[PDB]
Amino acid sequence: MRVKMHVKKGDTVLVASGKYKGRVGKVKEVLPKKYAVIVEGVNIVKKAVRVSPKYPQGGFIEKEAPLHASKVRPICPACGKPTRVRKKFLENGKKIRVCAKCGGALD
Amino acid sequence: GLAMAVADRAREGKLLLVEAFAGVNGKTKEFLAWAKEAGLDGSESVLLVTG
Amino acid sequence: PKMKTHKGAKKRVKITASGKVVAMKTGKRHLNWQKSGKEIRQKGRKFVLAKPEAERIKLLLPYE
RNA sequence: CGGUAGCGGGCGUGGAUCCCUGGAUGUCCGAAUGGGGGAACCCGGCCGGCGGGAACGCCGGUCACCGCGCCUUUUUGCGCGGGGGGAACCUGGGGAACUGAAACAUCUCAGUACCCAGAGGAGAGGAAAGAGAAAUCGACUCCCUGAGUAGCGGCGAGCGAAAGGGGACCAGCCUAAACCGUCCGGCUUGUCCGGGCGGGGUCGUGGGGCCCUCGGACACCGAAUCCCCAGCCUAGCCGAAGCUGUUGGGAAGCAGCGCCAGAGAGGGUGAAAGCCCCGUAGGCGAAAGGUGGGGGGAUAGGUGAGGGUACCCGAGUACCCCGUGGUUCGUGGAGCCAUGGGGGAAUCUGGGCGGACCACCGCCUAAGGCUAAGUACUCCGGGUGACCGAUAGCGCACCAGUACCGUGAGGGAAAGGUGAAAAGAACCCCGGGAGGGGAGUGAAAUAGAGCCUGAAACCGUGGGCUUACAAGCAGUCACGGCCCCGCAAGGGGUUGUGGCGUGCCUAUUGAAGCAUGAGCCGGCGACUCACGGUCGUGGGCGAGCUUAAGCCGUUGAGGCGGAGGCGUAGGGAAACCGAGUCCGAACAGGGCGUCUAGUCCGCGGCCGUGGACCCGAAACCGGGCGAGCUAGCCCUGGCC
RNA sequence: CAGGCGGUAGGGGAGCGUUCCCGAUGCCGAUGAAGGCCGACCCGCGAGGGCGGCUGGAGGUAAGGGAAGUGCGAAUGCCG
RNA sequence: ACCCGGUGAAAUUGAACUGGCCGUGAAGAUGCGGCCUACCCGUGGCAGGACGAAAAGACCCCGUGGAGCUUUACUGCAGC
Ligand SMILES: [Mg+2]
Ligand SMILES: [Mg+2]
Ligand SMILES: [Mg+2]
Ligand SMILES: [Mg+2]
Ligand SMILES: [Mg+2]
Ligand SMILES: [Mg+2]
Ligand SMILES: [Mg+2]
Ligand SMILES: [Mg+2]
Ligand SMILES: [Mg+2]
Ligand SMILES: [Mg+2]
Ligand SMILES: [Mg+2]
Ligand SMILES: [Mg+2]
Ligand SMILES: [Mg+2]
Ligand SMILES: [Mg+2]
Ligand SMILES: [Mg+2]
Ligand SMILES: [Mg+2]
Ligand SMILES: [Mg+2]
Ligand SMILES: [Mg+2]
Ligand SMILES: [Mg+2]
Ligand SMILES: [Mg+2]
Ligand SMILES: [Mg+2]
Ligand SMILES: [Mg+2]
Ligand SMILES: [Mg+2]
Ligand SMILES: [Mg+2]
Ligand SMILES: [Mg+2]
Ligand SMILES: [Mg+2]
Ligand SMILES: [Mg+2]
Ligand SMILES: [Mg+2]
Ligand SMILES: [Mg+2]
Ligand SMILES: [Mg+2]
Ligand SMILES: [Mg+2]
Ligand SMILES: [Mg+2]
Ligand SMILES: [Mg+2]
Ligand SMILES: [Mg+2]
Ligand SMILES: [Mg+2]
Ligand SMILES: [Mg+2]
Ligand SMILES: [Mg+2]
Ligand SMILES: [Mg+2]
Ligand SMILES: [Mg+2]
Ligand SMILES: [Mg+2]
Ligand SMILES: [Mg+2]
Ligand SMILES: [Mg+2]
Ligand SMILES: [Mg+2]
Ligand SMILES: [Mg+2]
Ligand SMILES: [Mg+2]
Ligand SMILES: [Mg+2]
Ligand SMILES: [Mg+2]
Ligand SMILES: [Mg+2]
Ligand SMILES: [Mg+2]
Ligand SMILES: [Mg+2]
Ligand SMILES: [Mg+2]
Ligand SMILES: [Mg+2]
Ligand SMILES: [Mg+2]
Ligand SMILES: [Mg+2]
Ligand SMILES: [Mg+2]
Ligand SMILES: [Mg+2]
Ligand SMILES: [Mg+2]
Ligand SMILES: [Mg+2]
Ligand SMILES: [Mg+2]
Ligand SMILES: [Mg+2]
Ligand SMILES: [Mg+2]
Ligand SMILES: [Mg+2]
Ligand SMILES: [Mg+2]
Ligand SMILES: [Mg+2]
Ligand SMILES: [Mg+2]
Ligand SMILES: [Mg+2]
Ligand SMILES: [Mg+2]
Ligand SMILES: [Mg+2]
Ligand SMILES: [Mg+2]
Ligand SMILES: [Mg+2]
Ligand SMILES: [Mg+2]
Ligand SMILES: [Mg+2]
Ligand SMILES: [Mg+2]
Ligand SMILES: [Mg+2]
Ligand SMILES: [Mg+2]
Ligand SMILES: [Mg+2]
Ligand SMILES: [Mg+2]
Ligand SMILES: [Mg+2]
Ligand SMILES: [Mg+2]
Ligand SMILES: [Mg+2]
Ligand SMILES: [Mg+2]
Ligand SMILES: [Mg+2]
Ligand SMILES: [Mg+2]
Ligand SMILES: [Mg+2]
Ligand SMILES: [Mg+2]
Ligand SMILES: [Mg+2]
Ligand SMILES: [Mg+2]
Ligand SMILES: [Mg+2]
Ligand SMILES: [Mg+2]
Ligand SMILES: [Mg+2]
Ligand SMILES: [Mg+2]
Ligand SMILES: [Mg+2]
Ligand SMILES: [Mg+2]
Ligand SMILES: [Mg+2]
Ligand SMILES: [Mg+2]
Ligand SMILES: [Mg+2]
Ligand SMILES: [Mg+2]
Ligand SMILES: [Mg+2]
Ligand SMILES: [Mg+2]
Ligand SMILES: [Mg+2]
Ligand SMILES: [Mg+2]
Ligand SMILES: [Mg+2]
Ligand SMILES: [Mg+2]
Ligand SMILES: [Mg+2]
Ligand SMILES: [Mg+2]
Ligand SMILES: [Mg+2]
Ligand SMILES: [Mg+2]
Ligand SMILES: [Mg+2]
Ligand SMILES: [Mg+2]
Ligand SMILES: [Mg+2]
Ligand SMILES: [Mg+2]
Ligand SMILES: [Mg+2]
Ligand SMILES: [Mg+2]
Ligand SMILES: [Mg+2]
Ligand SMILES: [Mg+2]
Ligand SMILES: [Mg+2]
Ligand SMILES: [Mg+2]
Ligand SMILES: [Mg+2]
Ligand SMILES: [Mg+2]
Ligand SMILES: [Mg+2]
Ligand SMILES: [Mg+2]
Ligand SMILES: [Mg+2]
Ligand SMILES: [Mg+2]
Ligand SMILES: [Mg+2]
Ligand SMILES: [Mg+2]
Ligand SMILES: [Mg+2]
Ligand SMILES: [Mg+2]
Ligand SMILES: [Mg+2]
Ligand SMILES: [Mg+2]
Ligand SMILES: [Mg+2]
Ligand SMILES: [Mg+2]
Ligand SMILES: [Mg+2]
Ligand SMILES: [Mg+2]
Ligand SMILES: [Mg+2]
Ligand SMILES: [Mg+2]
Ligand SMILES: [Mg+2]
Ligand SMILES: [Mg+2]
Ligand SMILES: [Mg+2]
Ligand SMILES: [Mg+2]
Ligand SMILES: [Mg+2]
Ligand SMILES: [Mg+2]
Ligand SMILES: [Mg+2]
Ligand SMILES: [Mg+2]
Ligand SMILES: [Mg+2]
Ligand SMILES: [Mg+2]
Ligand SMILES: [Mg+2]
Ligand SMILES: [Mg+2]
Ligand SMILES: [Mg+2]
Ligand SMILES: [Mg+2]
Ligand SMILES: [Mg+2]
Ligand SMILES: [Mg+2]
Ligand SMILES: [Mg+2]
Ligand SMILES: [Mg+2]
Ligand SMILES: [Mg+2]
Ligand SMILES: [Mg+2]
Ligand SMILES: [Mg+2]
Ligand SMILES: [Mg+2]
Ligand SMILES: [Mg+2]
Ligand SMILES: [Mg+2]
Ligand SMILES: [Mg+2]
Ligand SMILES: [Mg+2]
Ligand SMILES: [Mg+2]
Ligand SMILES: [Mg+2]
Ligand SMILES: [Mg+2]
Ligand SMILES: [Mg+2]
Ligand SMILES: [Mg+2]
Ligand SMILES: [Mg+2]
Ligand SMILES: [Mg+2]
Ligand SMILES: [Mg+2]
Ligand SMILES: [Mg+2]
Ligand SMILES: [Mg+2]
Ligand SMILES: [Mg+2]
Ligand SMILES: [Mg+2]
Ligand SMILES: [Mg+2]
Ligand SMILES: [Mg+2]
Ligand SMILES: [Mg+2]
Ligand SMILES: [Mg+2]
Ligand SMILES: [Mg+2]
Ligand SMILES: [Mg+2]
Ligand SMILES: [Mg+2]
Ligand SMILES: [Mg+2]
Ligand SMILES: [Mg+2]
Ligand SMILES: [Mg+2]
Ligand SMILES: [Mg+2]
Ligand SMILES: [Mg+2]
Ligand SMILES: [Mg+2]
Ligand SMILES: [Mg+2]
Ligand SMILES: [Mg+2]
Ligand SMILES: [Mg+2]
Ligand SMILES: [Mg+2]
Ligand SMILES: [Mg+2]
Ligand SMILES: [Mg+2]
Ligand SMILES: [Mg+2]
Ligand SMILES: [Mg+2]
Ligand SMILES: [Mg+2]
Ligand SMILES: [Mg+2]
Ligand SMILES: [Mg+2]
Ligand SMILES: [Mg+2]
Ligand SMILES: [Mg+2]
Ligand SMILES: [Mg+2]
Ligand SMILES: [Mg+2]
Ligand SMILES: [Mg+2]
Ligand SMILES: [Mg+2]
Ligand SMILES: [Mg+2]
Ligand SMILES: [Mg+2]
Ligand SMILES: [Mg+2]
Ligand SMILES: [Mg+2]
Ligand SMILES: [Mg+2]
Ligand SMILES: [Mg+2]
Ligand SMILES: [Mg+2]
Ligand SMILES: [Mg+2]
Ligand SMILES: [Mg+2]
Ligand SMILES: [Mg+2]
Ligand SMILES: [Mg+2]
Ligand SMILES: [Mg+2]
Ligand SMILES: [Mg+2]
Ligand SMILES: [Mg+2]
Ligand SMILES: [Mg+2]
Ligand SMILES: [Mg+2]
Ligand SMILES: [Mg+2]
Ligand SMILES: [Mg+2]
Ligand SMILES: [Mg+2]
Ligand SMILES: [Mg+2]
Ligand SMILES: [Mg+2]
Ligand SMILES: [Mg+2]
Ligand SMILES: [Mg+2]
Ligand SMILES: [Mg+2]
Ligand SMILES: [Mg+2]
Ligand SMILES: [Mg+2]
Ligand SMILES: [Mg+2]
Ligand SMILES: [Mg+2]
Ligand SMILES: [Mg+2]
Ligand SMILES: [Mg+2]
Ligand SMILES: [Mg+2]
Ligand SMILES: [Mg+2]
Ligand SMILES: [Mg+2]
Ligand SMILES: [Mg+2]
Ligand SMILES: [Mg+2]
Ligand SMILES: [Mg+2]
Ligand SMILES: [Mg+2]
Ligand SMILES: [Mg+2]
Ligand SMILES: [Mg+2]
Ligand SMILES: [Mg+2]
Ligand SMILES: [Mg+2]
Ligand SMILES: [Mg+2]
Ligand SMILES: [Mg+2]
Ligand SMILES: [Mg+2]
Ligand SMILES: [Mg+2]
Ligand SMILES: [Mg+2]
Ligand SMILES: [Mg+2]
Ligand SMILES: [Mg+2]
Ligand SMILES: [Mg+2]
Ligand SMILES: [Mg+2]
Ligand SMILES: [Mg+2]
Ligand SMILES: [Mg+2]
Ligand SMILES: [Mg+2]
Ligand SMILES: [Mg+2]
Ligand SMILES: [Mg+2]
Ligand SMILES: [Mg+2]
Ligand SMILES: [Mg+2]
Ligand SMILES: [Mg+2]
Ligand SMILES: [Mg+2]
Ligand SMILES: [Mg+2]
Ligand SMILES: [Zn+2]
């Protein structure tokens, strides 16, 4: 029974805390084992790389460091506000995620 | 001592007997309503003893 | 564990109402042919143990 | 697509990884089971298969032993079963010594440690040849009590019951024998004997058999056995409510206004979050497997009253004796239960027992077996701590029963922490490298990986004061000088000369002692706890005080429970009498008593028993491990 | 006001500090917890307790009570 | 052995700013007294002292300690 991530790739989410409090981005990737997410263009850092086949000019590269999955919040496709995931059993059977604020389907 | 404890609270005046709590059908806000009326604004701690 | 009564004391001695400790006079078990009547008589009685040894014996009879 | 990045390739809404349930596969060793063997390797028989397959090899199957059914033509076959492991707990067979007794032998330690066999989630025990004094109880086990009583005891050290009462649990059954039936065998041929099977039978108001009489045989009871179900376990799921401002590297902080609450447990998130995340309260959940001590169904089974008869009612048994064990019982007046030896009955008008023996009065029915629950334990799962926090807590938080030591049995460590995030320092410079200096990342690099904090011993660099005609437990008092902080006056550091000056601990009549202990620093390090006593003390109640186990409630809530314990009477070896009583002929005289105060809880001091303030023997005992060193011998070789 | 106040074994009395509990869903804390390093300062007879500067970086625990693995310099102690 | 380059232990160690004489003192003093002597620091050497190191004296005694051995010590067991 895997880690219970409240957000998937690539949801559109709000970086709700940290240095990037306020930013908005698509969930580029999820890392459940480490309980983290990577949001595009967020939490970027200046990694040094030795001169290589890949990096002949060497120097630095930029890359998005994973944020703690907790710091990130799903945004509603409907009301556009950041929300809290809510579970809703459909008519037929299998369940979906819905916006606790309004009620819209998160998809 | 049990009698003596209720006594200390009697003399202070901080003992109140009620025959029933009216609005409370189960929810916390219901008690909060009722408590307001008994003058339990929650500026002081309360032991609530009831079956 | 709980204390045991010293049966040796229990068989030789008594605690009176006030906690005095009495025993039989020693010295009459035998060799009496030449003991005077007075001596055999006076040894027939009980006597109260001296306080120090008395209070040691009372400790030995704790449920007494 | 484990820890795990890397190189190199894949998979997933056609529902992957992952979690649960049930399958499949499962080399070799191990009870180890075809045989051998120095475990993990070596060699086979029978039957099939494979390769060109005769030889050779591989593959599949099969072949150990013991017990019972002997169903087996003994031979031969078949069938069910056993073996080995398990943390502790359990029963049984055997069974120490140190120690205590201030020596020691009886005794104690103790039927303990330990060895061995066996049982199972428990095991043991268990439906009276009981208890033991009441005209009583009614299987066993477990807890409280009775009780440190009765007793046992070099009557020393010490040991130490039972009945009764209060509770937990609750449950009772099957046979042997008479007698009927049948079946194979006997040859003393038979109303006979023996073995098997079925029926019958199950006892202490004594029962049962067989013959006679009424009843009912369709009434009733009813599993500990079987069937079904609820419920439970082994994956999961739903689950209320926060915005904005602000300081900050970061908000959960501060400020403003809100909301939820059967949820304000807790953990996480860059710091301190009921409303961000996982959750929490409250609910919902299984196709499959396990359980099912609750609910329902069935089956096995089980049930009367008289009269007669005198057929049966567990044998080397009871019983007696000798030698012992058990019990509180140590030979004691020594019963009772058990039995190694000898003698050796009876079938109810019989036997055993109520502490020698006898009489009386009673209790019980031996010499066959089964039985749940209440109880014990903790390898394992969960929950919780006025439990530990890396020298602690398990030996082990980490690659630990490891490294290492030891022939072996066996011994047995040390070792946790960058950061919120690897952003883990490109690039330049010195250098063979190591290591550094710039740069860069970060809030912080005096977080740089030999990474949080970073004390002390210990080692250096720099500065102030000081020191080469003074001899000293190293300090101290004074004065003076220099350097420093100070408006002032005052102070800090250092020490030239003057005064005075026998380290610390322990052990001691006495130590600076040429008596003991300590290189120095850091950390670990010794009067506790339980039960029972005796005083003091803070309280509660008072001629009364008080509950124990347990039951109910809770889930950091208490209540119930009076059995029992102390006290309200003492004296006496006792019978016994009683404000008295004992010795005594006493109506002398003495002794011990009377002339009320206790009891429960907490705290403190001390005492008894426990290792009892901590560390230390030489030794004694149990069970294993060692003749790869050494001693001797046995077998087979070699050397001079 | 008067008198007493050397002290080993030992007896008595009053306190200081360590860990933990209640007090706490509290209060202190990144405007800096604990711990560390200094000090010629304050309070206390003393054990101590404060205050200030530096370090440190996430905890702390009041008044009043409760409980103990509670204080080291020596054990040819133990570990480093 | 000594000197230079390289590597680099140990027992021991309360701390030391560690002189002689005559006294003294638990009776054998670098450490107490009074005198005498001595500029500061080393290197190669000798062993008189530090009652030098090492080993909680093996001698001796003590402990109602241990063990091995003996016998016409006591009690017991095997064996006969
Ligand atoms: Mg960066
Ligand atoms: Mg929600
Ligand atoms: Mg005792
Ligand atoms: Mg005795
Ligand atoms: Mg005696
Ligand atoms: Mg007396
Ligand atoms: Mg005479
Ligand atoms: Mg006389
Ligand atoms: Mg007295
Ligand atoms: Mg007493
Ligand atoms: Mg691993
Ligand atoms: Mg990988
Ligand atoms: Mg791998
Ligand atoms: Mg690779
Ligand atoms: Mg690649
Ligand atoms: Mg599916
Ligand atoms: Mg295997
Ligand atoms: Mg074999
Ligand atoms: Mg086989
Ligand atoms: Mg072989
Ligand atoms: Mg062959
Ligand atoms: Mg074969
Ligand atoms: Mg046949
Ligand atoms: Mg046969
Ligand atoms: Mg046969
Ligand atoms: Mg079969
Ligand atoms: Mg078995
Ligand atoms: Mg076995
Ligand atoms: Mg047996
Ligand atoms: Mg045994
Ligand atoms: Mg046996
Ligand atoms: Mg002995
Ligand atoms: Mg003793
Ligand atoms: Mg002894
Ligand atoms: Mg002794
Ligand atoms: Mg003992
Ligand atoms: Mg035995
Ligand atoms: Mg016993
Ligand atoms: Mg035992
Ligand atoms: Mg069970
Ligand atoms: Mg049981
Ligand atoms: Mg059970
Ligand atoms: Mg059982
Ligand atoms: Mg049985
Ligand atoms: Mg039985
Ligand atoms: Mg009966
Ligand atoms: Mg009797
Ligand atoms: Mg009666
Ligand atoms: Mg009677
Ligand atoms: Mg009666
Ligand atoms: Mg009767
Ligand atoms: Mg004894
Ligand atoms: Mg006894
Ligand atoms: Mg005994
Ligand atoms: Mg005995
Ligand atoms: Mg007993
Ligand atoms: Mg008896
Ligand atoms: Mg009883
Ligand atoms: Mg009762
Ligand atoms: Mg009972
Ligand atoms: Mg119970
Ligand atoms: Mg019953
Ligand atoms: Mg039958
Ligand atoms: Mg028979
Ligand atoms: Mg015939
Ligand atoms: Mg015939
Ligand atoms: Mg048959
Ligand atoms: Mg039969
Ligand atoms: Mg029959
Ligand atoms: Mg029958
Ligand atoms: Mg009878
Ligand atoms: Mg009859
Ligand atoms: Mg009859
Ligand atoms: Mg008739
Ligand atoms: Mg009739
Ligand atoms: Mg009728
Ligand atoms: Mg009917
Ligand atoms: Mg049933
Ligand atoms: Mg499951
Ligand atoms: Mg569940
Ligand atoms: Mg949820
Ligand atoms: Mg929620
Ligand atoms: Mg603030
Ligand atoms: Mg809660
Ligand atoms: Mg709480
Ligand atoms: Mg927020
Ligand atoms: Mg979860
Ligand atoms: Mg939970
Ligand atoms: Mg609950
Ligand atoms: Mg509900
Ligand atoms: Mg739930
Ligand atoms: Mg199912
Ligand atoms: Mg099922
Ligand atoms: Mg299962
Ligand atoms: Mg069960
Ligand atoms: Mg089921
Ligand atoms: Mg049932
Ligand atoms: Mg039916
Ligand atoms: Mg029937
Ligand atoms: Mg009948
Ligand atoms: Mg017979
Ligand atoms: Mg016989
Ligand atoms: Mg007999
Ligand atoms: Mg006998
Ligand atoms: Mg026996
Ligand atoms: Mg005996
Ligand atoms: Mg016994
Ligand atoms: Mg006996
Ligand atoms: Mg006797
Ligand atoms: Mg006897
Ligand atoms: Mg008899
Ligand atoms: Mg016997
Ligand atoms: Mg016999
Ligand atoms: Mg007879
Ligand atoms: Mg006869
Ligand atoms: Mg009879
Ligand atoms: Mg009897
Ligand atoms: Mg009798
Ligand atoms: Mg007789
Ligand atoms: Mg009887
Ligand atoms: Mg029987
Ligand atoms: Mg049983
Ligand atoms: Mg567990
Ligand atoms: Mg647990
Ligand atoms: Mg702690
Ligand atoms: Mg450590
Ligand atoms: Mg640490
Ligand atoms: Mg460490
Ligand atoms: Mg360590
Ligand atoms: Mg463990
Ligand atoms: Mg690990
Ligand atoms: Mg490991
Ligand atoms: Mg281990
Ligand atoms: Mg391991
Ligand atoms: Mg070693
Ligand atoms: Mg890390
Ligand atoms: Mg970390
Ligand atoms: Mg660098
Ligand atoms: Mg270079
Ligand atoms: Mg080279
Ligand atoms: Mg830099
Ligand atoms: Mg920089
Ligand atoms: Mg910073
Ligand atoms: Mg800095
Ligand atoms: Mg690293
Ligand atoms: Mg790392
Ligand atoms: Mg390193
Ligand atoms: Mg290195
Ligand atoms: Mg270090
Ligand atoms: Mg350092
Ligand atoms: Mg300079
Ligand atoms: Mg200097
Ligand atoms: Mg001069
Ligand atoms: Mg001076
Ligand atoms: Mg001057
Ligand atoms: Mg100058
Ligand atoms: Mg200067
Ligand atoms: Mg200065
Ligand atoms: Mg100034
Ligand atoms: Mg100035
Ligand atoms: Mg001045
Ligand atoms: Mg000065
Ligand atoms: Mg000076
Ligand atoms: Mg001066
Ligand atoms: Mg001087
Ligand atoms: Mg002196
Ligand atoms: Mg010493
Ligand atoms: Mg002296
Ligand atoms: Mg000395
Ligand atoms: Mg001397
Ligand atoms: Mg000496
Ligand atoms: Mg000495
Ligand atoms: Mg030392
Ligand atoms: Mg030392
Ligand atoms: Mg020394
Ligand atoms: Mg050393
Ligand atoms: Mg201590
Ligand atoms: Mg003491
Ligand atoms: Mg004490
Ligand atoms: Mg203590
Ligand atoms: Mg006590
Ligand atoms: Mg007294
Ligand atoms: Mg008291
Ligand atoms: Mg009182
Ligand atoms: Mg009790
Ligand atoms: Mg409840
Ligand atoms: Mg309960
Ligand atoms: Mg709790
Ligand atoms: Mg709790
Ligand atoms: Mg209770
Ligand atoms: Mg009692
Ligand atoms: Mg009489
Ligand atoms: Mg009388
Ligand atoms: Mg009178
Ligand atoms: Mg008379
Ligand atoms: Mg007279
Ligand atoms: Mg008179
Ligand atoms: Mg007189
Ligand atoms: Mg009189
Ligand atoms: Mg009088
Ligand atoms: Mg009176
Ligand atoms: Mg009077
Ligand atoms: Mg009185
Ligand atoms: Mg006491
Ligand atoms: Mg004693
Ligand atoms: Mg000991
Ligand atoms: Mg003690
Ligand atoms: Mg004691
Ligand atoms: Mg011995
Ligand atoms: Mg020996
Ligand atoms: Mg061997
Ligand atoms: Mg050899
Ligand atoms: Mg040869
Ligand atoms: Mg030759
Ligand atoms: Mg004080
Ligand atoms: Mg709290
Ligand atoms: Mg708190
Ligand atoms: Mg809270
Ligand atoms: Mg407060
Ligand atoms: Mg900050
Ligand atoms: Mg501030
Ligand atoms: Mg600061
Ligand atoms: Mg310093
Ligand atoms: Mg200052
Ligand atoms: Mg002051
Ligand atoms: Mg304070
Ligand atoms: Mg202060
Ligand atoms: Mg700072
Ligand atoms: Mg600080
Ligand atoms: Mg932090
Ligand atoms: Mg406190
Ligand atoms: Mg505070
Ligand atoms: Mg306080
Ligand atoms: Mg306090
Ligand atoms: Mg309190
Ligand atoms: Mg306190
Ligand atoms: Mg301690
Ligand atoms: Mg010490
Ligand atoms: Mg030391
Ligand atoms: Mg040493
Ligand atoms: Mg060491
Ligand atoms: Mg050492
Ligand atoms: Mg260490
Ligand atoms: Mg050391
Ligand atoms: Mg030379
Ligand atoms: Mg040279
Ligand atoms: Mg050299
Ligand atoms: Mg010095
Ligand atoms: Mg001399
Ligand atoms: Mg001198
Ligand atoms: Mg010296
Ligand atoms: Mg002097
Ligand atoms: Mg001198
Ligand atoms: Mg030189
Ligand atoms: Mg040299
Ligand atoms: Mg020289
Ligand atoms: Mg010399
Ligand atoms: Mg020696
Ligand atoms: Mg000699
Ligand atoms: Mg001794
Ligand atoms: Mg002696
Ligand atoms: Mg002696
Ligand atoms: Mg000797
Ligand atoms: Zn919405």
From Swiss-Prot, chain A:
Its cellular-component GO annotations read:
ribonucleoprotein complex; ribosome
One GO MF term on file is: structural constituent of ribosome
Domain of life of the source: Bacteria
Alphabetical list of InterPro entries matching this protein:
KOW, Rib_uL2_dom2, Ribosomal_uL24, Ribosomal_uL24_CS, Ribosomal_uL24_KOW, Translation_prot_SH3-like_sf
Q: Name one GO biological process term.
A: translation
Q: Does the keyword RNA-binding apply?
A: yes
- Matching SMART domains: KOW
Keywords for the protein's UniProt record, in alphabetical order: Ribonucleoprotein, Ribosomal protein, RNA-binding, rRNA-binding
Oligomeric form and interacting partners: Part of the 50S ribosomal subunit.
The family assignment reads: Belongs to the universal ribosomal protein uL24 family.
Q: Which function does this protein serve?
A: One of two assembly initiator proteins, it binds directly to the 5'-end of the 23S rRNA, where it nucleates assembly of the 50S subunit.
Q: Which HAMAP family match?
A: Ribosomal_uL24_B (MF_01326_B)
* Official protein name in the record: Large ribosomal subunit protein uL24
Gene name for this UniProt entry: rplX
Swiss-Prot record, chain B:
Assigned GO CC terms: ribonucleoprotein complex; ribosome
Q: Which UniProt keywords apply?
A: Ribonucleoprotein, Ribosomal protein, RNA-binding, rRNA-binding
List this protein's GO terms for biological process. translation
* GO molecular function terms listed in the Swiss-Prot or TrEMBL record: rRNA binding; structural constituent of ribosome
Is-annotated flag, keyword Transport? no
Source domain of life: Bacteria
Q: Which family does it belong to?
A: Belongs to the universal ribosomal protein uL4 family.
Instruction: Give the protein's biological function.
Output: One of the primary rRNA binding proteins, this protein initially binds near the 5'-end of the 23S rRNA. It is important during the early stages of 50S assembly. It makes multiple contacts with different domains of the 23S rRNA in the assembled 50S subunit and ribosome.
Q: How does it assemble?
A: Part of the 50S ribosomal subunit.
Question: This protein is called what?
Answer: Large ribosomal subunit protein uL4
Organism lineage string = Bacteria, Thermotogati, Deinococcota, Deinococci, Thermales
Quote the range of the complete protein represented.
104 to 154 of 205
UniProtKB/Swiss-Prot annotation, chain C:
| Coiled-coil residues | none
Q: One of this protein's Pfam families, by short name?
A: Ribosomal_L35p
Write out the GO MF terms: structural constituent of ribosome
Q: Which InterPro entries match?
A: Ribosomal_bL35, Ribosomal_bL35-like, Ribosomal_bL35_CS, Ribosomal_bL35_sf
Q: Which UniProt keywords apply?
A: Ribonucleoprotein, Ribosomal protein
Q: A cellular component term (GO) from this record? A: cytosolic large ribosomal subunit
BP GO terms, sorted? translation
* Transmembrane residue ranges: none
Q: Spell out the PANTHER family in the cross-references.
A: 54S RIBOSOMAL PROTEIN BL35M (PTHR33343), LARGE RIBOSOMAL SUBUNIT PROTEIN BL35M (PTHR33343:SF1)
Q: Which NCBIfam families does UniProt cross-reference here?
A: rpmI_bact (TIGR00001)
Annotated family = Belongs to the bacterial ribosomal protein bL35 family.
| Protein name, entry field | Large ribosomal subunit protein bL35
What is the species of this protein? Answer: Thermus thermophilus (strain ATCC BAA-163 / DSM 7039 / HB27)
